[PDB]
């Protein structure tokens, strides 16, 4: 529309300059206000901790679709991602990476108070062949996949009683799940968490779940349900949040 097909009648340069200056001034005001608001916040602990009162639960590695683990006992490319994710995640837990960390007494909160904040050791040998020390494949090649269950980190949360993760198979409990360490016992010496800045080199407790697929029932879909049992502090029943103190996943090992 027009001789030049545009509306630039010596305009659209002055307009662009004016809006550039106006939005530069506006962005300067916004950035300065954001900075001056950020200066009022701590760098070690959130101002409000009432929106994350109780820990959730989560499984590792994250599958491609939902929380459904599917692979084949034969093809090594079907479970290559699981192996790589498990090996990358568990690297800071290995023997040569926890050397600097300290060793703490069991069954008691390690309530530190002072600008040192040492982190205890979680020996990867507690997972009992669900680590990569025995077999590089975490049981996927053998037909007994290993899955890690973790408790979401909350700054200053001190669980009471004896925390424990209770995983029960729902596929008629034919492939009896194996939970390590022991019966999923979460030790109290890793609590409380003091933050990403204060608690340097903090390794959280892990629970490893191995579902053993026999040749007779190979190819089914085992649904496992884990909960934070044994601690009244940590909630495990909630209608809306299906992951508050709980996690459910489906494992399918194709024959």
């Amino acid at each position: 529309t027009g001789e030049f097909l545009g509306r630039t009648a010596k305009s659209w340069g002055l307009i662009l300059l004016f809006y550039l200056v106006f939005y530069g001034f506006l962005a300067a005001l916004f950035s300065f206000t954001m900075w001056v608001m950020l200066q009022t916040l701590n760098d070690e602990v959130p101002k409000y901790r009432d929106q994350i009162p109780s820990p959730g639960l989560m499984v590792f590695p994250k599958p491609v679709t939902a929380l459904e683990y599917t692979f084949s006992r034969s093809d090594p490319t079907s479970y290559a991602g699981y192996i790589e994710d498990l090996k990358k995640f568990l690297k800071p837990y290995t023997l040569e990476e926890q050397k600097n960390l300290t060793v703490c007494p069991d069954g008691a909160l390690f309530e530190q108070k002072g600008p040192v904040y040492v982190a205890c050791q979680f020996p990867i040998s507690l997972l009992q062949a669900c680590s990569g020390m025995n077999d590089p494949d975490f049981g996927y090649s053998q037909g007994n996949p290993c899955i890690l269950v973790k408790m979401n980190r909350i700054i200053g949360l001190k669980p009471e009683g004896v925390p424990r993760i209770d995983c029960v198979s729902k596929n008629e409990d034919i492939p009896n799940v194996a939970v390590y360490p022991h019966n999923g016992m979460i030790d109290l010496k890793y609590f409380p968490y003091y933050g990403k800045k204060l608690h340097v080199g903090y390794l959280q407790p892990l629970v490893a779940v191995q579902v053993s697929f026999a040749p007779n029932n190979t190819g089914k879909e085992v649904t496992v349900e884990c909960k934070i049992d044994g601690s009244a502090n940590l909630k495990s029943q909630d209608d809306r949040d299906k992951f508050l103190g709980r996690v459910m996943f489906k494992i399918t090992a194709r024959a």
């Binding site: 809006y19 106006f22 939005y23 001034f25 506006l26 005001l29 916004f30 206000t33 954001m34 608001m37 950020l38 009022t40 916040l41 070690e44 602990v45 959130p46 101002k47 409000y48 929106q51 994350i52 820990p55 959730g56 639960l57 989560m58 994250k62 939902a66 929380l67 973790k150 979401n152 980190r153 909350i154 700054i155 968490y193 933050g195 990403k196 800045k197 608690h199 903090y202 909630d238 809306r240 949040d241 992951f243 508050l244 996690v247």
Partner: protein, 937 residues
């Protein structure tokens, strides 16, 4: 159906209705008959049941989109609760929220429209249609509703007929029956039976018509629903501009809704989520209630000017009264107080003074001169004015008189000097009377003289001094009739120049003793086809009365000069008096000179005067009759201050057409039947509410409740404050669209968690919905409104590129950044610092990632994240709404899970979203863009 009293003679009327046809029925009988028949002007129409008016607001426009969304949410929840046990109570609450939104929007529309309806219906009761009835002997003016079947009603020129009348007394009434018969040519009315059909006889005058000439008297026979009329049963430029703008912005809204719907479907939205997002981002963007807001503005300004004695008959007059560029006004009544007092006389070859304070005769003169005796007799006899029979103890001047102001002044002067005007009129019985007419400019009467040397018939004349001297052959000096010669005529003109040069209205008086041999005792005296010798009279003298300008009129003319409004004085008074009054009120300001003034400042004849050296002129009415159409254009184009003197009411149309050929918006003043074509041709027709005819009030577009010229200028100033308050409302309607669409754009671009959802988009639109209406309700005034040239309504647009660039991009962006600040603070005080949120959109919103880590190391499940997100959404909405209202209040003061508003170090709330506002209102102030939308900063 005829059923009328046409052929029924007068005797049965006294019987059929029980009223004597000389004094009318008594007040008690009138009230009793009224109680069993109802008000005269009932004519009741039906009405909308007032719940259809609410159902149309609920289910109508773009509220149907929200109803569809609610129905879809309810269907989704129904199929959900059917297929799956224990469903999520989310679609149900979403549908309930959408339904509440439509209900509240409809309620606001209803209690915004049925407030303008109340204001606009209040005006129709400000000037009740009245009627003159004869109850209990005397005439009492009552509301036309109180008129009842059978009472005596008087009608005159420019009088709407109260009801169907059986005429019993009439001298010249001609009704305008165009309302029923179609033809607008006046039809004479007489007390006799003339035709069989009621609609064609002459003794009946019909309801809702008006008598346009002369007076008549009738007996009411039919009231409203029984009348012959009761038995029988366009877009302003502002409206068109706003309609076009609404259509364009609605198209823009639909485009944005479609694009956002597609983008949300790309971002893995459920279909029920994307559809609701579309119908919410469309509804929140269309300018709903903008026509209601402009209606509120128009009705509020109409209400406020009616408080200043300017009663508009429609809302189109409100917007036209702000574009005025010419005001053709009348001297007497409008520009002058119309309260005259006699101050000078000229009967002999000397100017004689007059004064109040009855004692000492007032200054020095008395009844010594027979010339003064004759002049006082003429003044008393020709007057139609009579003192109201009350306040006898009150002073003669401090009395109440019914009649013309000039006649009232003459009556008071004669009562103070001579006295006993009523008995003087008793002595000289009035044989025939010719009423004063603006076309004739004189009043004629013939009286019976009981004198000794009387020729048995006395002729009395008063009127324009120069129109009377054109028919006078002798001048009465010291009681001796002398031939009218150039020795007396030039003295008369000098007296007129001196009395008229003080702004004093002058009347000329003359008589003639009708010879007895030509006019015996029983000579025929008929008003039509006069036979008395109107020519060749005997001049007696002149009387001049002061008519002071109204107190507020000089200031009003000053305001009109400050603006670009060209005031023209159209009067029937003499050029001397008109010029003096125009100079006195400031219509002809000091410095401006007439051609006759620059021919006298330097002594040259008028014919040698350069016309372009004069910017002020006084145009005689006779010199306007022979002017061509192109010749009037030279008067109006070159002269900036024009006075039309001795102009008939039927030349106002010529003047108004000549002014409108100049591309002006003419406001004209009229108070008569003859002014009606000018009142209808003019862009604004102004009628005098006090002394204006019903015909003029029908023709007019506006009524002056006080007959004050200054009220016209005050109404023009009030109507000028209609476009600056309209673009304010448009901008305030448009400012909230950027805070509602920027959250999704930043969502997509920066991949942050969603700052605002499509329930709080509708909540923002609902909260910030009445802000423009409240803004124009609290709007006080402006300053330079009357120092601004008149609007050019044809080539001046209410909406320009600077208003749109303001709303969509300088105020909306500030508000959006305030809401974003609130969202960022709420997120950062729970652990997620602003730098952490960038790119977090996909880990967030993933229901199967329940260990999302914040800036402090903690890990959040999906529901824990979503509670904080819901808090951020509600805080965004609350911040936007609260800051919009607070900005409204601050702007009207300075220049003429809801976390926000919290005190606990919550400067993140409305505090900053308004602090950016007040920090940019100062930078836009300092940059000082002159071409000036530095307001709406």
């Amino acid at each position: 159906v005829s059923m009328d009293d046409h052929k029924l003679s007068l005797d049965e009327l006294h019987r059929k209705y029980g009223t004597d046809l000389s004094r009318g029925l008594t007040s008690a009988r009138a009230a009793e008959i009224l109680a069993r028949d109802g008000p005269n002007a009932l004519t009741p129409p039906p009405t909308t049941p007032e719940w259809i008016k609410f159902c149309r607001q609920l289910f109508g426009g773009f509220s149907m989109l929200l109803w569809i969304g609610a129905i879809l949410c309810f269907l989704a929840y129904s199929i959900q609760a059917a297929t799956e046990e224990e469903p999520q109570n989310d679609n149900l609450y979403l549908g309930v929220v959408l339904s509440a939104v439509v209900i509240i929007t409809g309620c606001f529309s209803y209690y915004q429209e049925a407030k303008s309806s109340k204001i606009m219906e209040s005006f129709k009761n400000m000037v009740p249609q009245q009627a003159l009835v004869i109850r209990n002997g005397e005439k009492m003016s009552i509301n036309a509703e109180e008129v009842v079947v059978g009472d005596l009603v008087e009608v005159k020129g420019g009088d709407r007929i109260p009801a169907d009348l059986r005429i019993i007394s009439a001298n010249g009434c001609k009704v305008d029956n165009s309302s029923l018969t179609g033809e607008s040519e006046p039809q004479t009315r007489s007390p006799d039976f003339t035709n069989e059909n009621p609609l064609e006889t002459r003794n009946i005058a019909f309801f809702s018509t008006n008598c346009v000439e002369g007076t008549a008297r009738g007996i009411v026979v039919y009231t409203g629903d029984r009348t012959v009329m009761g038995r029988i049963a366009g877009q302003t430029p502002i409206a068109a501009e706003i309609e076009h703008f609404i259509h364009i912005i609605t198209g823009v809204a639909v485009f944005l809704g479609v694009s956002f719907f597609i983008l949300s479907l790309i971002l893995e939205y459920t279909w029920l989520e994307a559809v609701i997002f579309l119908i919410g981002i469309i509804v929140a963007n269309v300018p709903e209630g903008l026509l209601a807001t402009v209606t509120v503005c128009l009705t509020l300004t109409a209400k406020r000017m009616a408080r200043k004695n300017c009663l508009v008959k429609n809302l189109e007059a409100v917007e036209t009264l702000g574009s005025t560029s010419t005001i053709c006004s009348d001297k007497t009544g409008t520009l002058t107080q119309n309260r005259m007092t006699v101050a000078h006389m000229w009967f002999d070859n000397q100017i004689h003074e007059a004064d109040t304070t009855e004692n000492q005769s007032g200054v020095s003169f008395d009844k010594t001169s027979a010339t003064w005796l004759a002049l006082s007799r003429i003044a008393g006899l020709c007057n139609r004015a009579v003192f109201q029979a009350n306040q006898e103890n009150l002073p003669i001047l401090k009395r109440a008189v019914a009649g013309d102001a000039s006649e009232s002044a003459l009556l008071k002067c004669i009562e103070l000097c001579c006295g006993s005007v009523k008995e003087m009129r008793e002595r000289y019985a009035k044989i025939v009377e010719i009423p004063f007419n603006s076309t004739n400019k004189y009043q004629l009467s013939i009286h019976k003289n009981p004198n000794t040397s009387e020729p048995q018939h006395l002729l009395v004349m008063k009127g324009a001094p120069e129109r009377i001297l054109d028919r006078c052959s002798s001048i009465l000096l010291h009681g001796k009739e002398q031939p009218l010669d150039e020795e007396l005529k030039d003295a008369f003109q000098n007296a007129y120049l001196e009395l008229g040069g003080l702004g004093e209205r002058v009347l000329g008086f003359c008589h003639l003793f009708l010879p007895d041999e030509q006019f015996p005792e029983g000579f025929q005296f008929d008003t039509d086809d006069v036979n008395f010798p109107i020519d060749n009279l005997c001049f007696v003298g002149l009387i001049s009365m002061i008519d002071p300008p109204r107190a507020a009129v000089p200031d009003a003319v000053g305001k009109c000069r400050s603006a670009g409004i060209k005031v023209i004085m159209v009067t029937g008074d003499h050029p001397i008096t008109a010029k003096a009054i125009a100079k006195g009120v400031g219509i002809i300001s000091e410095g401006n000179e007439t051609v006759e003034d620059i021919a006298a400042r330097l002594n040259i004849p008028v014919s040698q005067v350069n016309p372009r050296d004069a910017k002020a002129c006084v145009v005689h009415g006779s010199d306007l009759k022979d002017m061509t159409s192109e010749q009037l254009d030279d008067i109006l184009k070159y002269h900036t201050e024009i006075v039309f003197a001795r102009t008939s009411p039927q030349q106002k149309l010529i003047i108004v057409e000549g002014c409108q050929r100049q591309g002006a918006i003419v406001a004209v003043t009229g108070d008569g039947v003859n002014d009606s074509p000018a009142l209808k041709k003019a862009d604004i027709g102004v009628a005098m509410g006090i002394a204006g005819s019903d015909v003029s009030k029908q023709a007019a577009d506006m009524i002056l409740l006080d007959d004050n010229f200054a009220s016209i200028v005050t109404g023009v100033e009030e109507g000028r404050l209609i476009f600056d308050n309209l673009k304010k409302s448009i901008a305030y309607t448009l400012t909230s669209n950027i805070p509602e669409i920027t959250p999704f754009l930043i969502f997509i671009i920066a991949n942050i968690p969603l700052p605002l959802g499509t329930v709080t988009i509708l909540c923002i639109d609902l909260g910030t919905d009445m802000v423009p209406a409240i803004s124009l309700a609290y709007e006080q005034a402006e300053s330079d409104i009357m120092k601004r040239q008149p609007r050019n309504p044809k080539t001046d647009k209410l909406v320009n590129e600077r208003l749109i660039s303001m709303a969509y991009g300088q105020i909306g962006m500030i508000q959006a950044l305030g809401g974003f600040f609130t969202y960022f603070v709420i997120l950062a005080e729970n652990g997620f610092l602003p730098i952490h949120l960038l790119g977090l959109r996909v880990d967030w919103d993933d229901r199967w990632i329940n260990d999302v880590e914040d800036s402090y190391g903690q890990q959040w499940t999906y529901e824990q994240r979503k509670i904080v997100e819901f808090t951020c959404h509600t805080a965004f909405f609350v911040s936007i709404v609260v800051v919009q209202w607070a900005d409204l209040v601050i702007c009207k003061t300075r220049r003429n899970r809801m976390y926000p508003l919290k005190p606990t170090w919550w400067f993140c709330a409305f505090p900053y979203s308004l602090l950016i506002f007040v920090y940019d209102k100062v930078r836009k102030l300092i940059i000082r863009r002159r071409p000036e939308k530095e307001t709406y900063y």
